[model samples]
Target chain A: PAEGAFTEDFQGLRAEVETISKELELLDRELCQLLLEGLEGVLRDQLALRALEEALEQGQSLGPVEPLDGPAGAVLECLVLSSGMLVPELAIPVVYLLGALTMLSETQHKLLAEALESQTLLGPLELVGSLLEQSAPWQERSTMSLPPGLLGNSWGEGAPAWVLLDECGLELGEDTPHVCWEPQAQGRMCALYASLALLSGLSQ
Target chain B: GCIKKAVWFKC
Candidate 1:
């Protein structure tokens, strides 16, 4: 029975990876569509123009931002460095960083806050949830608990599940292939979340 | 207080 439990968790996690791998693929496509087709030429150009205006008003360089190692560098690093605020992982960080330069000259706290608020990062969080659910075992393991949304707060009014999972901690390399999965890290998602709470306030 | 929802295998 004890061994059965481990087998179950292993199987569940495998299944979850299979399921989430597909969903993430779909989300990538959806993100592309939303950025390109939905927003299209005009809206995209306008957002670029707005970013440029903000840059110029701040008396900062308008050169292109430096690229990270790879395609997902910005997203992955933002996730790791920013402590899980999807907004910074998406587009808000760029805006906030640039807006900060403007603030240096103008000292416009209100404008910074406005720009930060506009930097909402909504991704396919549902896909993460589906992945977690798919990977959960039939029997609870003593070694670990299930993933939570928004740290220890659970999936409720402000604590969405995806937010928690994305922000939660794991055993890192201790868990081998499933590096991000952390049953023992349950309820500590809040701890992880707290570590990076200042991310939003940094520029604002 | 760490409550985990039980898995329903059929689902």
Candidate 2:
């Protein structure tokens, strides 16, 4: 190449190598706070619910944005800790939302092997697993119902599938895909299935 | 009592 061309090529190569390393070296404070804050948010119910709603809406699970690569870690942490809380009630919703988070972020399958290794996590899962297997049969079901044309108003088409289902008065039914992404489903059985769904890595 | 049990049996 020409002398001027070589100068441009050398500069381009230098920037390519320097750019990514600079990101690691910079250590921005805003970056640290935001990722920490976001991780804290997942541990809280309100934000977890929001993520579940959106994941169901967009037909995609929300994973950790950039730095917080193990949002699954956050979810699993909640699951294990909640198990010790004595109320399956508190634990139930965590797993219910995990159904959405667990499946959508199921790509974390290999990444989560570490999270599942402990009995703290694994115990409740299989404990619930074997128990839910047997106990599930005894739990009763109440089908969802709404009067004809019960709820018809929604923010807009962009709102979310569950909003559409709610306006239609639908329940996620035991097998419905988290947000009822497909409206054809209805009815639900034992609440324990929520725990089962997030045994975090499932047969899926 | 109701809410706690409500979590278990869904009737």
Q: Report lDDT (CA) for all predictions.
A: 0.31, 0.30
What lDDT score is found at residue A89 in candidate 1?
29
Stretches of candidate 1 exceeding 4 Å from the true structure: A1-121, A138-167, A172-179, A188-204, B1-11
The fraction of correct interface contacts reproduced by each prediction comes to 0.00, 0.00
- The sequence of per-residue lDDT tens digits that candidate 1 reaches over residues A91-204 is 443333333233221212222223234542122223233334443542333233333332232343223333334344333221323224556443333222221222222222
lDDT per residue as tens, model 2, A78-115: 22223322223223333343443433222232212323
Share of native interface contacts present in candidate 2: 0.00
Which ten-residue region of model 2 chain A has the weakest summed lDDT? A181-190
User: Chain A structural similarity (TM-score) per candidate?
Assistant: 0.20, 0.26
Identify the candidate with maximal lDDT: 1
Candidate 1, what DockQ?
0.01
Error of 2 at A131 (Å): 2.2
Q: State the lDDT at B11 in candidate 1.
A: 9
